[PDB]
Amino acid sequence: KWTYFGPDGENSWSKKYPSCGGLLQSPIDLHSDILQYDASLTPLEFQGYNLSANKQFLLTNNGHSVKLNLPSDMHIQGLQSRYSATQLHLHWGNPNDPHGSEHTVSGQHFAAELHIVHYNSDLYPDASTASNKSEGLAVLAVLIEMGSFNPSYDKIFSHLQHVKYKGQEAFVPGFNIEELLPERTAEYYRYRGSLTTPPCNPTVLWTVFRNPVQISQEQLLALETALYCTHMDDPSPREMINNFRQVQKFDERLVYTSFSQ
Ligand SMILES: Cc1cc(C)nc(Sc2c(F)c(F)c(S(N)(=O)=O)c(F)c2F)n1
Ligand SMILES: [Zn+2]
């Protein structure tokens, strides 16, 4: 069992999941000392991200986040191999300190973070197999700040009061997942790291977009207050808050940027 708070929290993940104490761990603070421009980093292309509106996709509260299942025909092109999507989900803080992204930029958290998980489908039959191979996974990260309402993020958030408890599910009509991405997607940070949850496998090629998107005050507060880690009618609920990992050491290494500074 793992959590973000108390005896099963992140300083204890290495007891059940040894890779959480291993090398290449994410997330990290993206700061000047550790950045270098790499002009060979080209734009990713996002294929099949305009999901059919006549199809539904499963939204689930899994006890650790809210996750939307994504289809195999969605992928990114541009890496050595094609990577196919498997799911997206979010990380956030809480209303008294609404700074719960995973990655930080020059020490600042953002309000929340979206992850769109993909696996190397040219070399591996599924995401479980890929998850133990170097560069087996590729995750896209979008930093989220509070400001303007976001109609495209609302296609997910409008369902939150109906997946309040662990194990609950909703169906979301397809919509264009590219509208969750920020401006200037050609500008990003790129590095080799790990899953930021157990089992913390060091097998993720990260792409964190440079620019954040905005969601409203009301949307961020729904995300921070609607959900629980526990089942309905568990007599001692646990609020799903602060489900982000602290930044990790990152020494002797570099994050590559597709933008110059
Ligand atoms: C290790 C493994 C195997 C499989 C099949 N899916 C997953 S899904 C997943 C994942 F791949 C991720 F990269 C992450 S994250 N926070 O984006 O690092 C995650 F939370 C996840 F839930 N992870
Ligand atoms: Zn994540």
Strand partners, 57: 172
Ligand nearest to the CA of residue 137, numbered in listed order: 1
Residue 201 Cβ contacting ligand 1 at under 6 Å: yes
Q: How far is the CA of 137 from the centre of ligand 1 (A)?
A: 8
Ligand nearest to the CA of residue 196, numbered in listed order: 1
Which experimental approach was used here? X-ray
User: Closest ligand 1 atom to the C-alpha of 87?
Assistant: 8
Task: Looking at 33-144, list the stretches that DSSP marks H as alpha helix, in order from N- to C-terminal side.
Answer: 127-130
196 is in an annotated binding site: yes
Q: Is it true that the peptide bond before 182 is cis, omega within 30 degrees of 0? A: no
Strands (E), the chain: 29-30, 35-37, 45-47, 56-61, 66-69, 75-77, 83-92, 104-105, 112-120, 137-147, 169-173, 188-193, 204-209, 213-216, 255-257
Q: How far is the CA of 2 from the centre of ligand 1 (A)?
A: 14
Q: How many DSSP H helices and E strands does the chain contain?
A: 4, 15
Residue whose CA lies nearest to ligand 1 atom number 18? 195
Whole-number Å distance between alpha carbons of 150 and 156: 11
Count of structural domains, the chain: 1
Of 225, 219, 239, give the one whose Cα is nearest residue 156.
219
Task: Looking at 61-187, list the stretches that DSSP marks H as alpha helix, in order from N- to C-terminal side.
Answer: 127-130, 151-157
Residue 127 Cβ contacting ligand 1 at under 6 Å: yes
Residue whose CA lies nearest to ligand 1 atom number 16? 196
Residue 204 Cβ contacting ligand 1 at under 6 Å: yes
Whole-number Å distance between alpha carbons of 119 and 85: 7
103 is catalytic: no
Hey, what amino acid is at 239?
Answer: E
Residue 131 Cβ contacting ligand 1 at under 6 Å: yes
- Could you say which of 64, 159, 162, 231 is catalytic? 64
Query: Which pair of structure tokens corresponds to residue 62?
Result: 């899994």
Q: How many angstroms is the resolution?
A: 1.5
User: Closest ligand 1 atom to the C-alpha of 102?
Assistant: 16
Q: Judging by DSSP bridges, how do beta strands 75-77 and 137-147 pair with one another?
A: unpaired
What is residue 161's three-state secondary structure? helix
Q: How far is the CA of 76 from the centre of ligand 1 (A)?
A: 17
Ligand nearest to the CA of residue 200, numbered in listed order: 1
Length, in residues, of the chain = 261
Residue whose CA lies nearest to ligand 1 atom number 13? 195
CATH of the domain at 168: 3.10.200.10
Whole-number Å distance between alpha carbons of 176 and 174: 7
91 is in an annotated binding site: yes
Whole-number Å distance between alpha carbons of 56 and 173: 4
Whole-number Å distance between alpha carbons of 158 and 138: 28
Mutate to test the pocket of ligand 1, among 65, 101, 137 (most ligand atoms within 8 A of CB): 137
3-state secondary structure 68-90: EECCCCCEEECCCCCEEEEEEEE
89 is in an annotated binding site: yes
Give the structural domain span for 170.
1-261
Of 7, 11, 16, give the one whose Cα is nearest residue 199.
16
